[PDB]
Amino acid sequence: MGPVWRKHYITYRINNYTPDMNREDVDYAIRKAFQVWSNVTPLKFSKINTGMADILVVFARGAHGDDHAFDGKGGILAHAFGPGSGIGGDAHFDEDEFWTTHSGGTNLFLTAVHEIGHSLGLGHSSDPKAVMFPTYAYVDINTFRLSADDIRGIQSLYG
Numbered sequence: 001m002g003p004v005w006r007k008h009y010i011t012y013r014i015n016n017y018t019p020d021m022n023r024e025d026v027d028y029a030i031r032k033a034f035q036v037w038s039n040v041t042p043l044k045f046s047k048i049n050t051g052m053a054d055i056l057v058v059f060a061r062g063a064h065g066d067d068h069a070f071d072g073k074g075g076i077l078a079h080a081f082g083p084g085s086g087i088g089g090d091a092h093f094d095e096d097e098f099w100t101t102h103s104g105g106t107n108l109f110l111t112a113v114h115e116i117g118h119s120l121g122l123g124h125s126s127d128p129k130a131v132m133f134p135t136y137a138y139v140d141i142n143t144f145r146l147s148a149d150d151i152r153g154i155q156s157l158y159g
């Protein structure tokens with residue numbers, strides 16, 4: 001019942017890069033996170049560098065220009081706007097976290113999967129093994145899979 005994109009081609013742009021990781025690793029984590037959702041829907045995601053993307057990926061700190069101020073290290077890791085124009089769809093990551101490609105700090109890929117879920121219109125799950133469960137958990141990235149509840153949720157919105 002969340003808001004949905006009324007198109008199946010969706011662009012994203014990485015507005016800026018956390019210094020916690022190198023650029024290529026941020027690109028990879030984000031690309032893989034989009035792929036998780038495209039794998040089970042008719043949605044396709046293209047990265048653009050120049051132009052007007054639907055989903056802007058932003059790393060920012062504290063009060064950063066919207067109604068969802070961050071809180072420094074810990075607590076809220078990120079937040080994202082549901083489908084819509086402008087700031088709609090955009091996914092913001094708290095730079096006061098330490099973003100990583102691994103089990104240390106906060107795993108960017110896993111957080112991005114959750115965030116992109118919100119960017120596509122998903123709410124939270126009650127399944128503790130669903131990526132849309134409200135609180136972060138690290139799971140081995142190689143064996144990561146959407147739960148049946150996540151797939152149900154996203155397939156109910158698209159396709």
Ligand SMILES: NC(=O)[C@H](CCC(=O)O)NC(=O)[C@H](CCC(=O)O)NC(=O)[C@H](Cc1cc(-c2ccc(-c3cccc(Cl)c3)cc2)no1)CP(=O)(O)c1ccc(Br)cc1
Nearest residue numbers: 074075076077078079110111114128129131135136137139
């Ligand atoms: N509490 C925690 O474990 C970590 C912090 C750990 C730390 O100290 O670094 N924080 C969190 O988990 C916090 C809790 C927020 C709260 O206080 O309610 N959640 C958040 O930060 C939400 C953002 C968020 C959640 C996740 C996540 C969730 C589940 C899993 C997962 C779980 C099980 C299996 C698998 Cl495979 C994956 C992985 C990542 N990744 O990012 C914030 P949001 O939901 O986008 C949101 C909602 C409303 C507003 Br307004 C703004 C943003």
Ligand SMILES: [Ca+2]
Nearest residue numbers: 072074076094
């Ligand atoms: Ca925080």
Ligand SMILES: [Ca+2]
Nearest residue numbers: 054086088089
């Ligand atoms: Ca947008």
Ligand SMILES: [Ca+2]
Nearest residue numbers: 020095097098
């Ligand atoms: Ca950081």
Ligand SMILES: [Zn+2]
Nearest residue numbers: 064066068092
């Ligand atoms: Zn924000």
Ligand SMILES: [Zn+2]
Nearest residue numbers: 114118124134
């Ligand atoms: Zn959430």
